[PDB]
Structure formats: structure tokens, C-alpha cells
Amino acid sequence: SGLVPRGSHMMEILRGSPALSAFRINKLLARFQAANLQVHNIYAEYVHFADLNAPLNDSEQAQLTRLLQYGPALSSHTPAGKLLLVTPRPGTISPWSSKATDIAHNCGLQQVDRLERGVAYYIEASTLTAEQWRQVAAELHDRMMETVFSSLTDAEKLFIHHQPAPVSSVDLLGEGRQALIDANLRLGLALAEDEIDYLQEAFTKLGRNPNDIELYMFAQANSEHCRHKIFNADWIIDGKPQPKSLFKMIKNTFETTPDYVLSAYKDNAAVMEGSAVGRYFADHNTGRYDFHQEPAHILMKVETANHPTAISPWPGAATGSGGEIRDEGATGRGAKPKAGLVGFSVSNLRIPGFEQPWEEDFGKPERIVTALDIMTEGPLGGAAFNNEFGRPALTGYFRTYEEKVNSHNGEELRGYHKPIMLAGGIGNIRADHVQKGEIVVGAKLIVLGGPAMNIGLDLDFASVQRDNPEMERRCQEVIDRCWQLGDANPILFIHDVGAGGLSNAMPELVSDGGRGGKFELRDILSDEPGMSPLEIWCNESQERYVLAVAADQLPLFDELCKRERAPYAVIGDATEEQHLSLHDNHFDNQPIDLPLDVLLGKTPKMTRDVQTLKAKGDALNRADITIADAVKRVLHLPTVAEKTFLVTIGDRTVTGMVARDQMVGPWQVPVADCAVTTASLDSYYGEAMSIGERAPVALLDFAASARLAVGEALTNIAATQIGDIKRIKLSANWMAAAGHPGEDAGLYDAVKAVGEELCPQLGLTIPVGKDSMSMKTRWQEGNEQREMTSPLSLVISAFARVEDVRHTLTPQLSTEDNALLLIDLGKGHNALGATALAQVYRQLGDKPADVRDVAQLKGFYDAMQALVAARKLLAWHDRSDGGLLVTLAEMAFAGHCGVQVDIAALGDDHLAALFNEELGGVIQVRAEDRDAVEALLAQYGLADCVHYLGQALAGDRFVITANDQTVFSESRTTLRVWWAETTWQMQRLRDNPQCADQEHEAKANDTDPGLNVKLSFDINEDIAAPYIATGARPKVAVLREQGVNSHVEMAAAFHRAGFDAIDVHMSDLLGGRIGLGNFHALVACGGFSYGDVLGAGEGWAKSILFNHRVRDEFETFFHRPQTLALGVCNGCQMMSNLRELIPGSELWPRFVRNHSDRFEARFSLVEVTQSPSLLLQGMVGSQMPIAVSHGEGRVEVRDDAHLAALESKGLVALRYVDNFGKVTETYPANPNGSPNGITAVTTENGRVTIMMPHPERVFRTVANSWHPENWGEDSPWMRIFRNARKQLG
């Protein structure tokens, strides 16, 4: 390896492995050909750069070299052709770097100051000009994050030490107002004239020049983003002063319905009442996991990341989720995220070779990415955060819209060039932590989390975000430790770090407590020593929280952080005086010195004096429309179409509390209308999340669009067992182009429509929300000015306590004798304006849907709740995009059956009856219950809306009649494949196209029987019960490393089998607080230890191997004659890297990147095979589904000799099977490409078993996405843990 001087350090260059699989190489070559770049071949290798602060001895050097060996064993090639090295841009540090460096440090290599990675491309193209070489280089890197170099040694530029930049004053005293004008422009403060006035007067009064940092801080605190001027403005509309702000109209819903609300408008989440259940976690003193019976109340929040996602969509969406997760954990005095939701709105995809007939290219700003790039990289970013942090993503929306329409301001381009990127979720919180505590004078003021870097301050580099989810998981564990101390929780006050960085968050924190603060700049953790005080204080670096703790709790807080490996710094003290001081020990000066009332003082309230514009719609021109062609087009609208590309990329099982995910039934079809989690691992109480949104309707009727968003949230949630509608609480997220003609009045009318009218009438609170007020994009296209302006876009998220998660209905049709009933809350209006139908024929139409009758909407909800509780429904699916046609089609997909329905009672206009998007939906009931159900509906005033349609039938026919006429008839399989083509095409361009194609094609085989089970044992027989009945409970070491996230449910699985589950962190073993000699059983848990950097599980394993003491400890345990060990997912990966310590493991494979090249969150069919594994005794020959959630689960052997030997030794314990029951390598039945379906192996003695899937996530029947109806509480997988208990005796 290379090793050269690098300032006061030395940089080593270490060659890595091949970086690109053959499909990615072929895609690059095909792109060069399409651009007329004659490239003969391309080969890529990873290259690692280690900046060292002191030398490595031979043993250390071998360790570093070994740390940097990871990844799929693709064949090396001797470099040939022109080198183009792609790295992060100078002045940035990749998250890869942060994590790789942490691993080196935890392996004892303190001489490593920083590791960084690039990709060396070797391009053979003898014919190319210097300009064409620049186009080659452009294809190989992301201009917003990366640079291209011509030498490996050029990477020294990434590690240049810069001296701290000093504070700069702005010379108000020496130049007058012009100094502020100049600084406003130079620093991009975006200050209004009255803010310049305010600043001039404040600093004139103080008799000194403002520092840049003080002006920047002020400017971020007074931005529209941060201060919500529009939502607090006075209004005049059509010449009449209005009596309430938009914010006051939202709060009206709380004044009317305070019921069940614990916290609203006083934190960065709302809180509502949950249920008393067993909160499961490890005691501070014992380290033992136990149930704590108490209220688990429910917090909720929804954020957006719309501007950053237009610029750099991966980190935009990633930090959209990451920032919202911090909002959750900083609720109260600390709380715990539980599940997420995700939303996207973008312009037309225009997928190459799959262009749809409504799509027209209208151009876009050069500086933003395309709609397709947002939907490619954005979902991956959001999922990278949710997967690596560890929260399941269980509901969402995805809308495409881009059209030239005759809307409120006449004919113009309306769409989402600036996208909606929405991220939200629910969490749980203890009752005594909901209220923020007092900040005592003298409280210590702390930053918990990541380093600062210069983030948030080519073209828009300031909008390129950066995510490190594992850092935030580390912080969440500290927060967890704190709230888990109950009355001894040392957090007095916590707040997330977001917009404005420390410059907003710390002043907010002290101000919220009625205190001031004094801070020391040089106590803040920084990874960029060149940064100015402005950059340090104001940057928008991620994964940070601020909190206040009493001085006497610092030793406790320090112990908590050190055990989790969460960085923290004490950076100031709360003061009685309401002043803000920031001192700098390096420069011996005071960058900030301000009264808080100056700093947080307000310019006057805004007044918006505006006028109504109302579009007259145009009647839908039906010339080119037929029912058959409409069905085909609508199924091809991404808004309607199957969403799998957004769903399987994100974990849906972490925590073991997910009851209802998006995928429904044996055929795992993503049509669930809402998410449901259990409240704990010991209850059937739970929580539900749904979304309603209908932006295109706002192009015709602003208030109708907002009413439908509320209505649809309710219809999506309605077949979940909740009870009182007042239990349902809403987030309202308002996206608008404020100032665009007609939008401001429209916004006011829409907020009034829901806040003053519909939600109070229904009994719905809106206790949380946000606004994003610049939803438009302008650019120069020809000679012409162009603009793309969003509709007003309200997104409602609904959240509710659930009474019994077991009673949730889905769209999965039964074929027992049945009746299908439409509940048409449209009352026969059958509107077609602003529908999917209209959109797919390039039109807006005339009049949209709306809430037609408030009492009947409420009646619908209550009738559904009565039917759910009485168990009278077989299925439910609501009507939304694509109308009744799509509702029925999606039900037939989920039921893998046909329908025979007649629509003669829905009007003479069959098109309008089928494609209107009025509220309501289809219930399925048992035929014998039809009359009673209809009487029930009639009791709620719905008789007029209720219509018998027909029945679900076995087979493949989707038939719509009207008397004796066939209106539409098609193969259900044909429809289901058309509906899949969008996700097919997205998967195909994003992932391994062979996998995309296999997944797509399997949908066309109607004989697929779906997931099905065969059991070799009695699922209900607790073989551990006689042991448990003795009260003797063996310990299990529940092993976790930093970034592990699946340890709680693992503990709970062993607990149910009779173990005392002990939390054992790798820090515990390294510090002597735990020794494995005291245990007879050990389990290595799932997650993303070190973010999987350096190969999943490798940093964890090598941290053990390279500490001789801990290594010996593991080796001793494994060589004992009676010990048992299990490794699941990340723990399986980890243990596969410890073969040298594990007897009988010599034939084990490696686990590497899935063949799909994508994270796979699947509910996959496996079979238990004959092997020595003691943990699978009694289960051989069983077939049943299991939770899969991994990106590096593919079994990789050295050669066929190794595969054959492993197989002949008989050590394979689980294999993927297809639904026909055969061992398979076809995707996604086998989700990762593992040869012979292998996904678990054991040792020769059967005492150690490792597996990729997660039995601990699905030990509870209620947590199985699909399962046989007759199962009880226990799934088949409970047997693994019971086997471990019995084996111990």
C-alpha cells in the first residue's frame, strides 16, 4: 500500500475490490454509446485513503489492510486505460468516512485520523478528445457531491488542515446602512427592508458593529421557513379583514376538540393518549430486559424536505426522515420513534422507453434534478435513513402531476419540479415526560450527536444535505437510556437541531425555559477546523440534539453516552439573565453578545391583502376516451399504479410491533389503506397511521381539495378498530406557491374549510402541522420565462390509538359466499374534474369531488367502526385515485380472484360512475350478512349511498355489467400486470434488471398459490412451559454493537421462552462489566452496526478479533461444550466473520450484496431443512413465511467446491422456496440470490446457528404480514426460542 507525506500526517493508499457488477458496467457502456462516446471498456475499483497521525507497526498495518477487505468477491482486473478517480469533494467528509474511521478507532487504530473512499475508473477509449473526456467524467460522478481527479495522490487534497477562520464584523458604524445592505447580499441573508431597519437600530443602540455570525443567526431565525410569517399574518380577502390567522384557524380544532390530546403547539411533535401496556427495555441497574406496565402515549409529527430534494434527492429525503426522527426523540423530556411514513409528489416521470400519452416535456431549470431522478434516488435516501436508524416505514403516498391546465390564473404549467418530500411518523412516550421540564439556572447545555461540518450554508451546494443514520441511532439509545430512568431521567429539556443549526436550537432551548445562555465555541465538536464562528454556529449538520441537564447529572450522562458510543459536548450554561453570549477561546473574543429580546425581537406582523381567483372548469372532452382505454391509461398513472419500488426498499418489521404493513395477503400486494402497529410486544392495543391528499383538485377548488384530504385520511383508516372518531388526530402539511395569483386566497379558504368547518364538525383535532410556502420553480427555456407552479397541496396524516390490531380489514377479497357493497359518499354526483381519468387524457375537467355531506361522512366512519368491532366485514378498500374501477381492481389483485359487478344503479354515465374519485369505498361481507349490514348502514343515514354491486368469485375474470350490457370485461391478471408496469420499469432502471424482470413476470402466472404453510409440529405446544414453570430462567446475552436496532424484540422472543435477557453492548465486554463465562446462551442481533461500512457485520467482528482479550472471550464461549449461540441478520453477518473462533464453522459462506443490488424488505417463504441445528429441532420439513430485511444477505462461496462441501456436510438449515414449494434462486421468492436458496447454516455440533431472516420479528402471529386464520398467539418461529430453552434444561 501507498504512504506519502500529507502535511503533519501521512496518507496511505489501499486498493479495494471491484466496485461495479456486470450489469452496472453494461449500463455505463450503453450510456457512453448513446452519447456517441466510443468507450471499449470500463472497470472500477474502490480505493481507500488513510490519513495517519502516527505510524503503524506490521501487526497494525495488517489489521488496517484486513479492515479494508470487504464486499462481493468480484474478479479483479489489472488496471488499463485512463484513470478517473471519483471522490467526495474537497472540504466534505463522506458518511462512509465517519463510520469507517469509527471502526478503525474501535479496533485500536488511533493513528488513523481519517479514512476516505473513492472509486477508480479505468477507461479504455483510444479515440477521445479532451471535451469528450470531460463528458465521460460527467457521467461518472455526482456534480453536487463529488469531484474527479487524474491521480490517486490527488486525494491528499481531501485531508488538507485549514486554520480556523476568524469572525468578521460588518461595519455599520463606519459606513452606515450600506454595510447591512452589502452584508445582506454578500451573505445571502434575504432580509426585508424592515429587518434591515430593525438590525440598524439594534446595533446602533448597542454602539457596536454586528458580527457576521450575529446577522446570519438573526436571518435564519426570521426566514419564512423558521418564523411562519404567512401562517401568523393578518389577512384581507376580497376587501374584508378576516378575524383569524391560518394558525389560529388550525388551533380552532383543538379549542373545539381537546379530547385525548396531551401536547399540541408547544413542542416539535404532538402527543395524544395511548394505552397501558408493557413497555419492554433493559433496567439501568441490572441490564435485564423486563416489561413495565404503564401508559405508552403516542406522539406524532410530519416534516418536509422539498427544497433540498430538488437539488440532491438522496440526502434531501434522507434528512427529511432524519430530522423528523429527531423531532420525535426530542419530544418532551425524551421519547422513542416507532414507525414512519413517506410521501413524494413529482412531475411526470417520462421513463425512457415507457413514455405515457399524457406526458409532455416542458423543460426544467438546469440546477434541479428531474422527476425521475427524484423518484430513483429520493426513496432510496428516505429508506437509507429509516433502515439504518431502524424504524419501519409503513404507509405513504406517491403522486405524479405535470400539465398545462386552465386553472385559477388561466392557462399555465402546474406540477412539482420542486417536489414534495414528506417524512413523518409516530412514537411512544411516558406520561411524566410529555411536559418539558424547568431549566434551572446553571444547567449544563449539551450538544448530543454528530460533528459539525460546513453543511447548509454544480450551483446550489448549500442545499446538498448529508445523512449518517447510525449516528442518530447512537443518540436515540442515549435518549432511551434517559427516559428509561423514569423519575431519574436527567434530561430537563431536549430539542432537535434543524434549520439554523445551533444558532436557532440553542437560543430556542434557553428561551423556551425563560433563561439565557453562555457558550464556548471551542467546546463544540467539529470535524472541520477551518470553519468560521458563523459556520460553526449556523451550519445545518445532521444528527444533533440540544439538551439541558443539571450539573450533578453529568457523570450519569457521560456514562450513558460512553456506553452507547454517542458523542456529546458540554458547550454552555443556562443563566438567569436573558442574554446570549458565545465566547471563542481560540481567538480570545466574543462572537456573540446579545440580549435575547434583541435577538428574538419581531418586526411587525405581515398583512396579506389578496383576492379570490376561481377557475371555471371545462367539461371533459371524451372524444378519445373509451372505458377500455381509460382502464389501461389509469392503471399506468404512477399515482395509481403499484408502489412496490417504494415499499420493499424500506424495512417493515423492525421492532416486532408491525401488525399491518402495505403488503397484503398471500400474494403480498401493496394496497393496505393504513398502517397498524402494536403498542407493545405484549398487547393487541396499537396505533394506526393513514394519509389523505388530493392536490390536483385544488386546480379547480381549493376548499374541496382540503376537505377531500381529510375525508380520504378517514376512509383509509376506517377499517381499523378505533371507536370514537375523536381519537383520530391529524397532521396538516400545507404546500403552496404563496404569492402566485389565486393561491393565497385559496390557502386561506382551504385552511378555513378544514380548521373552522369540517374538522370541528367531525370532531377531528389538528394538533400538529407544517407549511412550505414557495412551491414553484422558474427558469429560462427558449428566449422565454417559464414557470412550474404546484397546486395547493394539503397532505393530511391521520394518527389513532387502536383498540384491537387483530380486527383490521384489508382489501384482500374472500371467495366464500359474499356480497360487495359500494358506499358512495359522492351521493351520485360522480364528479370527473381533477381525476386520474382527466389527467391521463391531459385535461382538468369541470367540477371535482368534495365532501358532500358532513353528517354522512361521520355516519360512514361510525358505521364502519361498528362493523369492524362486530367482525361483520371480510374486506374493505376505499375509493381514491382511479375511482371505483381501481378500488375493485386492487381488491381483486389482493384476493387473487375475480369480480362480477353491475353498475346500472350508479347512473347512466358509466365512465363517471367508474372513474369519479368521490369519497367512499367497497365493503365485502358474508352473503348471509348482507341484509343486516345494509340495515346497519341505513341506521347511520346512508341508505341512499349504499349499492349492492355483486360478488367476488374464484378465477380470473374482472367483469362490469349494466343490466344486460357488458360495460368492461378483462383478465384480472392482465389488469394486475398493467398496474405493475410502473414499478417494473422503476425497478428495472434502478436495480438489477434481471431481478426486476423476474419479479414482474411472476405476477403474470395466475397459478401462483401465494404464501402457504406446512407445519411439522404443533405451533401451540409450549415445549418450554415445564421449564418456565420451575422459575429457573437461564440468562441470554443479547449482544449489540453501535448501530444494532433489533435487540429489543430479540430479547422479548427469548423472554417468552423463559430466558432472562441481558443487554450486552460490545462496550460492556470491552469495559469488563460483562463476561461471557456467566452465560450459556448468546445471540448476536440485527441492524446496521457501523452503518455496514466496511461490509455488513465486519466492523463488529473485527473489533472483536483485533482485541485479544475480547477475542479470547468469544473463542472460550464457543468452545465450551454446552453453550448455544444464534446470529440473526447483522449478527449472522458478524458471526460469519468469526469462523476462526467458532468450532465446526470451517465451511460457512460469506454474506454479501444482494443480487438485486437493493435492500429487500420482504415477507419470504422458507423451508426448514435437515441439519444438526439444535434451535430448529422438531421443525424440519416446515414451510412458512418469515421477515426478511437486508441488503447484504447473499450467500457467497469461494467456489463450487466450497458450496458442494457445505451442502454435503449437511449444515444448511433454511432455504428460500417459491410459493409452489420448490427451492429457488428466482427473485424475489429468493430475495437475495443465495445459491440453493441458502439462508441459514449451523455448525457440525448444531450448537451455533446463523440466519439472515428475522424470526424474532415474527414470533407473534399478529406481527406476520399474512398468516393462516387459525393461528393463535404464537407463530411457528416461537419454536426456535423454546428449543433453546429446552436444550439448556
Ligand SMILES: Nc1ncnc2c1ncn2[C@@H]1O[C@H](COP(=O)(O)OP(=O)(O)O)[C@@H](O)[C@H]1O
Ligand atoms: N412513498 C411511499 N412510500 C411507502 N409506501 C407507499 C408510498 N406511496 C404509497 N405507498 C403505499 O403503497 C400502497 C398504495 O398507495 P396508494 O395507492 O397511494 O394508497 P391509497 O390510494 O389507499 O391512498 C399503500 O399501502 C401506501 O401506504
Ligand SMILES: [Mg+2]
Ligand atoms: Mg391508490
Ligand SMILES: [Mg+2]
Ligand atoms: Mg386507500
Ligand SMILES: [Mg+2]
Ligand atoms: Mg391516497
